[PDB]
User: Which sequence fits this backbone?
């Protein structure tokens, strides 16, 4: 027995290890913990624009209604505030943002759990090979290791698509809200 | 060969069992949900606090405004001014909000460290066992196994400090949300 009989030597060991390594490459040194926080700060940043969004909605509707006492005499001023309210019909993308976030937060929890399952199953595979008479059981554990590594990568891939989209939409609606605030006063 | 058996890969040496047992009661502390749940638990504290922080400054502004309005008639409205001043004494709680902030930064740092050390522990024990099975390095096997134990103890130390700091953060959060709630309701009625 020597050191390198303990390293991915079979071909399914090599594949599982390849799949495990580019998980390691995707997360890199800050690992799953950085990827969990990045969602939580997504959520927080959203919550802040959510509340700016409802603040400005209330204020525009109130200024509108005050002016509408004398609707005839201030119709064009009313039409401008109606124009800000049309611009602020963005309820559908706050909902879309909260959907991406719910999905990101679920997929990174699954990705972490799947990552660990892969490492464990590869380790059990290797042990089963080194135990000399169980290479079929070695093979099964090393294939499960790859199938867990692959579940992890797909979970990470959706995490990234959904976090990216939540960011693009967060920035769209922060702009609309900022534009309505600057417009209004 | 038929020499190298399954139990042979398990903690067999004294240092390996020491590091094993430290690893397992990290595993028992964090449970099935693991570091992810505990990292989220800090995030959840942080938001909660942000909401109470902003109710704090909300009611602070409104009491001070209400007070000044009355103080345009200082002598005619003095007892009504004393009550408002009483709410301001009650709300002199800035120190508590910084302390929560201090508990939350510590907790979020310590769970990040705990997670790193836990990983380093499992890698070191794995390397130790491998070195023993390699047959001529039981001294370098001992060193990685001792290393494994020292990382596990680093993680447990970080998890202890995490739990204490999250606990104190939570107790201090209840105090402020209650003072604020009380201030909010004395000001309405």
Assistant:
């Amino acid at each position: 027995i020597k050191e390198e009989d303990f390293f991915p030597s079979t071909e399914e060991e090599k594949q599982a290890d390849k799949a495990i390594k580019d998980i390691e490459n995707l997360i890199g040194e800050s690992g799953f913990p950085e990827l969990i926080e990045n969602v939580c700060s997504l959520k927080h940043e959203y919550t802040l624009i959510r509340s700016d969004f409802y603040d400005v909605i209330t204020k525009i509707q109130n200024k509108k209604i005050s002016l509408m006492k004398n609707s005839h005499n201030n119709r064009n001023k009313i039409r401008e505030l109606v124009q800000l309210q049309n611009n602020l019909k963005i309820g559908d993308e706050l909902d879309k943002i909260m959907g991406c976030i719910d999905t990101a937060e679920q997929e990174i929890r699954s990705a972490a759990f799947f990552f660990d399952e892969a490492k464990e199953s590869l380790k059990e595979g290797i042990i089963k090979r080194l135990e000399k008479s169980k290479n079929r059981a070695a093979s099964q554990l090393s294939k499960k290791a790859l199938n867990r590594a692959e579940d992890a990568l797909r979970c990470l891939e959706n995490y990234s698509s959904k976090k990216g989209e939540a960011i693009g939409r967060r920035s769209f609606i922060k702009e609309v809200v900022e534009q309505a605030k600057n417009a209004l006063s």
Summary: Chain B has five helices and no strands.
